[PDB]
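Exercise 7. Predict the joint structure of the components listed below.
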Amino acid sequence: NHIKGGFAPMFNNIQVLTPEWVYQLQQGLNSDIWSGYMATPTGFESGVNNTTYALLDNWNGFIWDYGYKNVMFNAYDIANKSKGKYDQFYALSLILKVEGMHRMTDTFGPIIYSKFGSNDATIAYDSQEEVYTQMFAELDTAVAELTKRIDAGEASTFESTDMTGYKGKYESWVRFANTLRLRLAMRIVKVKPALAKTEAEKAVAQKFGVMLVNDDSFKIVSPVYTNPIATISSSWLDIRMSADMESIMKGYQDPRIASYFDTSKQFPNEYKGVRTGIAISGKSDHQDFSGIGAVVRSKEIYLMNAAEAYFLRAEGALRGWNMGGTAQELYEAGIKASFDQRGVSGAAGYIADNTKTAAAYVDPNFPENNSDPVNNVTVAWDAAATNEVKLQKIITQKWIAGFPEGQEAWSDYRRTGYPKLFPVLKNYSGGAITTEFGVRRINFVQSEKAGNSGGVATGVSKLGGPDNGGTRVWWDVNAPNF
Amino acid sequence: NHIKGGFAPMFNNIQVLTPEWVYQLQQGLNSDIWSGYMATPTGFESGVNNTTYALLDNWNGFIWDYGYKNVMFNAYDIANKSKGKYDQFYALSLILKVEGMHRMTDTFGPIIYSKFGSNDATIAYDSQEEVYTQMFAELDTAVAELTKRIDAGEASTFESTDMTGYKGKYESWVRFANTLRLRLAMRIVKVKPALAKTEAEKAVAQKFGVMLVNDDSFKIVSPVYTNPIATISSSWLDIRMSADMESIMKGYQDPRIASYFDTSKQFPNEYKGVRTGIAISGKSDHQDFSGIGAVVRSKEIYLMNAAEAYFLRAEGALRGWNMGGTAQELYEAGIKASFDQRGVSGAAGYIADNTKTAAAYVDPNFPENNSDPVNNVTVAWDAAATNEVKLQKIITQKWIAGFPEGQEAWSDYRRTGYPKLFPVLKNYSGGAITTEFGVRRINFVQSEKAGNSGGVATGVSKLGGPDNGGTRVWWDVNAPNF
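Solution:
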């Protein structure tokens, strides 16, 4: 009973479910926009903000503070109480820890990890390379422990505490952990392709393997909280469909558009997105473009869909790895999984179409925001296509399937450059962040500079360059995809 | 006859031998100082300059302009005249091309390579990753061609054109090419350890192997010019012994100090170095510190010593690669090779010393420039030391042996962080360049922004971040040494 209470704040703060204004700062005004998923019609701080590459420390500190207070602390506390005593809870805490904390390192680079809880005046940061090794080892520990208990036929003691689709089922938690390993493996393929291959193949070959059906998906099922985006969109009109989403989903005439977005008030019965990184004269100019749709009007918040497992395996197969299918088979299975998850028909026709491509983008009353399409690729698999075009197809479909979870899409975009996104028109970074490559990370936070200046200095050392949004984290090496 | 004339400008402009003021800008006021080899007593441009991390476009453009006009153009011209007709000359041009142009990409990152000589308005840059692949392939072509001729007993037709220690001997040119391959292979060990291993092992496996004795060293033997550093130092007093060299070489009581540097005029019979990245009141405050010594009072300019081949193999052995010998054997052999090269005795005692370490640095009349030692490692091999300490020993000895060739030392320092160097006290980069990590590259040059703006845009794209001195080139990944 003293252990079980630590899980709720972990579940409730991977994405901060309440209050909504905290989610808006934790993710809504960073990766949800940089990923190309969503855009704001509001000219916050005179239009000089995260969306125009002037990173705002007053906004971005919330990411660190809520994650450490609610995810990391409880991982630490649960481990202290359970490791070597109630190892099933320790194992489950490790899986949740990695789910929450990989997002943290993917945002900042170096982070506090091994030294968390230290009483030293300096709480040192680990390098991102070190954190990734630790996370893979933590998943090793968790998977071995739970698999042992499953093999023994041990009844779960986690159902009453679980807040996911899994209802305490250890096998489902292991399958999630395997899929999370596969995500982390693919993340590092440019910097450590040998480790990427090892960890990816381990994930797929583990007894219970990775996600195969939609019931395998990782989601938070809250008894009381709606996805915060519902309020930020429908109530506040502070976030809308993006121009990238309009270009790509209208181009493909994608039936998932109906659940992802609402038709526009300003343009009745039409799906209209807002361009990011623009000049904004008044909020009313874009607030009546398309809102975020029914997928966020729910107490269930998806954090990793089964579709992603297929697209990860498809990329692994493209790279020649032992993924259990061909790149084409896995690509097409991923698309079908997503169509099924969204409850829409026509997957077969969509999959076979080798004509439809991204559409031109028009901002009707502000043509300065217009663009020719940039993600110029069809859905249909072409065996004769280059590896880059094959990867572009896979990541495009992965990006569509993963909406509205902007953090993973931002990480995948940084790594692969896909899908192609419209560049910002206004860049107020003073040269620190490029228009072509956009935001590569967020700089170390105010609470840390205030209370842990010695730690921040270790973080800067392990970052290897200026502490701004243009400096690449360890896995985001300036290197080609193959 | 029409082909041979192209070689002289290549030989004479890897380091620009004349005029001396051009060498000062090409290398003397960048890597010769950033490497920790040398320091200026002169407060050029009010002390806001390359040495205080305000990169000066009017200085640094010389690197690109002289390299492309004299090395690259002649490689291109010779290839056009000789490829498929006189392949011995083509092969030799490729080796010289890689010797000159690897320095170029190591300085800027993306460079013009495959598209050189294009008539298009945009002459596109290649990525550094692409350039490295091409250089390895060029060395493959050169090595195969010359080895074929050697195997056939074909007499050299290059002696009258050669301006090195090799006197036209193809076998010595192949041995140099192998050693250059090994250098380039180790450079990329953090970004592409698989390719690093492949290319390093190829270098050693080739039938002539890498440099073994000092006569194998690559040097320019000028019939007319003295090393331009002799003038810059002795005549102009614009460059002096550095504080890092004083700390390290005095700490070890290294007998090579006597030929590397002259005793100070201000401090009779003492070796005194100047701190880099400082405030300078007047040139006279430091101009009478130690000058650069007898090693530059020569018409022979060393560009790759046999000692480096041993230290490359030593590091390869640390990594478990097929290098011939143990890390300890190769380390000690490299030190002996360097002592022999410089004509000094006492190698055995120096090699066995496990006490002497870097000395504290004092600027007698300006104590604000003082520092405790930072390269705190002894010479003696310790089998029980960590891989990092072993590497620190190897690179420290490599750094001493390679004086006064600052470019390779700067590249090795960027890759490994060794030897430890004194940080600058003044940093006028406006945040673009960190004090901790120093200059990682030079920004694209004025002549290119003026006459090839389309090409520069491709270079910036292939750089992956802001075009300034803090952005890391492809091989300079933020990753650990092992």
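Discussion. Chain A has one domain: 1-482.
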